[PDB]
Amino acid sequence: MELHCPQCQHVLDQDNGHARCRSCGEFIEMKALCPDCHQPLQVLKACGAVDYFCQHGHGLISKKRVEFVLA
Numbered sequence: 001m002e003l004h005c006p007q008c009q010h011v012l013d014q015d016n017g018h019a020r021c022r023s024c025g026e027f028i029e030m031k032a033l034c035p036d037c038h039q040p041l042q043v044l045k046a047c048g049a050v051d052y053f054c055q056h057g058h059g060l061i062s063k064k065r066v067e068f069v070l071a
């Protein structure tokens with residue numbers, strides 16, 4: 001069933017930190033927050049690989065554990 005929009009109610013096509021409205025046309029970007037912080041994660045860019053570091057003192061957070069909010 002996936003996630004639906006709270007406005008242009010349709011399917012949200014979600015990838016890494018990004019959600020494009022399929023069937024809507026709209027483009028949405030999402031923030032990667034640490035669940036235990038609610039502050040943004042440090043996007044560690046290694047060109048090919050990207051790590052999400054909890055800038056605060058918790059360690060590394062995977063994109064399957066991160067909390068994505070509407071940006």
Ligand SMILES: [Zn+2]
Nearest residue numbers: 005008021024
């Ligand atoms: Zn939509």
Ligand SMILES: [Zn+2]
Nearest residue numbers: 034037054058
């Ligand atoms: Zn944290």
